Nucleic acid binder design. Structure first.
Ligand code: ZN
Length: 512
DNA sequence: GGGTCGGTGCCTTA
């Protein structure tokens, strides 16, 4: 029968949307849902995510409920559908009671064909009761990765949508998202109760995006230099904390660079104005927390900067994926400091042990492995998402500037010697002063001139040496014990490196 | 030389 349903779908594709043909995989997804099967759609490339549920919604007789994470997303999606003559509506707190009653009346009557709604509203026990007295044709959960990303802590009603799926077993369910690795895919199936879903995964390759990493040495200065080299094209700078995004914004506005902070601490209409100025290109740069995310419709973001490393590869992929949507060259730049990773691990140890923390820890660890990789950045991303590839890309920082290594036994002995010289007590900021024998008070107030480690490594610049110590921490030769003021202690692997018995190769740092 | 670093959003009708 399959041919009959697709022709009805093809007609909707042409009549209400004006498009000519289905693109590869669109037909197979729409076919599946039109014959009653559940579906999980992971579409990082393709741009036809919304059509995958909106077209079967218009072919099926009955109501389609679209679960949506953001009020602004609901409104934008409803607006586009009404512009196409489709009877779409949404429900949210910003409406009046009279407005909501009219939406619900249209739902009972069937005037409304697609209803956009947040999980917190839909999962109310009495609301689900009134659903039974409608003609429900399909449920589609947009940005379904929220089920897993938020359903366990931030917004628990995202994990309750399975209760809805169990209440209406004969109504097909769709989960659709742009970013999801294997763990997230199975979690969506599990928490949503999809019954043997068709799983369709498109490619994660964005050839026009250039993945770049720079080691954080003087962060603000490097961030200043990178932006001033962008010569006024649009971009986003992500940081962790609201305080940081507010500070950095003011520093760039101190130069005359068009830049504005964005975070959830700002009143909402401020958020709408910054998002709108940015999108109409009257604002060059947005400094932002993760709050600046879903629903940003801007085709010409030319750079996305991560001033702080994200928590997992999915977040990094989704965030860098906002760049170069027009297909023209764009750049992703990550300012990496291993200290930011250890800060992220603390935040994780701060939470309850168990399987959820085990996964968050592995996701974090994989992100740190992406940052530390001495191989094509694109090969790490693609394979992490299960898309097998071995050919390096030629458009990452590893491919364009291959790593170069030098014998570090000399420099690492000079460093490993000077860190034992303090008896495990100084931090990295202290220890690197003695290796370049700069003149200051505690190198005499404690008496740290009468060591031959003082003034031994002025030969090379400051970035070179703290890079060495970071490399030794990564190899397990030095620890950073933050339980005693970030002092560098020495481990048991340190021994053969001071003796010169073990060979050692170190990479030069990432610098522009 | 400076994060002393968390951060994401629905929904309120006793
Ligand atoms: Zn590459």
């Amino acid at each position: 029968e399959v041919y009959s349903q697709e022709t009805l779908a093809k007609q909707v594709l042409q009549e209400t949307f004006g498009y000519q043909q289905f693109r590869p995989g669109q037909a197979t997804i729409i076919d599946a849902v039109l014959e009653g099967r559940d579906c999980l759609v992971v579409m990082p490339t393709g741009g036809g995510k919304s059509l995958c549920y909106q077209i079967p919604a218009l072919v099926k007789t009955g109501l389609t409920i679209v679960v949506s994470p953001l009020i602004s997303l609901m409104k934008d999606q409803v607006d586009q559908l009404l512009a196409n003559g489709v009877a779409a509506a949404c429900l949210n707190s910003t409406q009046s009671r009279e407005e909501q009653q009219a939406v619900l009346a249209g739902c009972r009557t069937g005037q409304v064909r697609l209803l956009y709604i947040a999980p917190e509203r839909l999962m109310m026990d009495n609301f689900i009761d009134t659903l039974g007295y409608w003609d429900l044709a399909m449920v589609a959960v947009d940005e379904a990765h929220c089920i897993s990303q938020w359903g366990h802590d931030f917004r628990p009603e995202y994990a309750a949508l399975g209760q809805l799926r169990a209440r209406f077993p004969a109504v097909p369910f769709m989960a659709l998202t742009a970013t999801a690795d294997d763990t997230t895919r199975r979690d969506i199936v599990r928490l949503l109760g999809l019954d043997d879903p068709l799983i369709e995964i498109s490619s994660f390759d964005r050839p026009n995006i250039r993945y770049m990493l720079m080691e954080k040495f003087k962060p603000l200065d490097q961030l200043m230099r990178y932006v001033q080299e962008q010569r006024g094209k649009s971009g986003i700078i992500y940081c962790n904390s609201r305080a940081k995004v507010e500070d950095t914004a003011a520093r760039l506005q101190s130069r005359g660079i068009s830049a504005a902070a964005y975070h959830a601490g700002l009143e909402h209409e401020v958020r709408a104005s910054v998002q709108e100025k940015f999108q109409r290109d009257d604002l060059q740069i947005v400094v932002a927390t993760v709050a600046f995310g879903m629903g940003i419709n801007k085709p010409n973001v030319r750079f996305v900067v991560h001033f702080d490393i994200p928590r997992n590869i999915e977040s990094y992929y989704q965030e860098t994926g906002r760049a170069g949507r027009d297909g023209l060259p764009a750049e992703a730049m990550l300012f990496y400091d291993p200290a930011d990773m250890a800060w992220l691990r603390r935040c994780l140890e701060e939470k309850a042990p168990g399987p959820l923390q085990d996964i968050e820890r592995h996701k974090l660890n994989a992100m740190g492995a992406f940052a530390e990789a001495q191989t094509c950045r694109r090969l790490v991303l693609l394979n992490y998402f299960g898309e097998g590839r071995q050919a390096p890309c030629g458009n990452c920082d590893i491919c364009l500037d291959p790593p170069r290594r030098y014998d570090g036994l000399v420099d690492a002995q000079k460093a490993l010697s000077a860190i034992a010289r303090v008896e495990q007590r100084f931090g990295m900021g202290y220890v690197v002063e003695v290796l370049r024998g700069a003149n200051n008070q505690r190198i005499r107030e404690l008496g740290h001139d009468k060591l031959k480690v003082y003034g031994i490594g002025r030969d090379q610049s400051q970035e070179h040496w703290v890079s060495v110590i970071r490399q030794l921490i990564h190899l397990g030769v030095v620890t950073q014990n933050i339980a005693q003021h970030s002092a560098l202690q020495l481990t048991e692997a340190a021994r053969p490196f001071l003796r010169g018995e073990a060979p050692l190769m170190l990479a030069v740092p990432r610098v522009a």
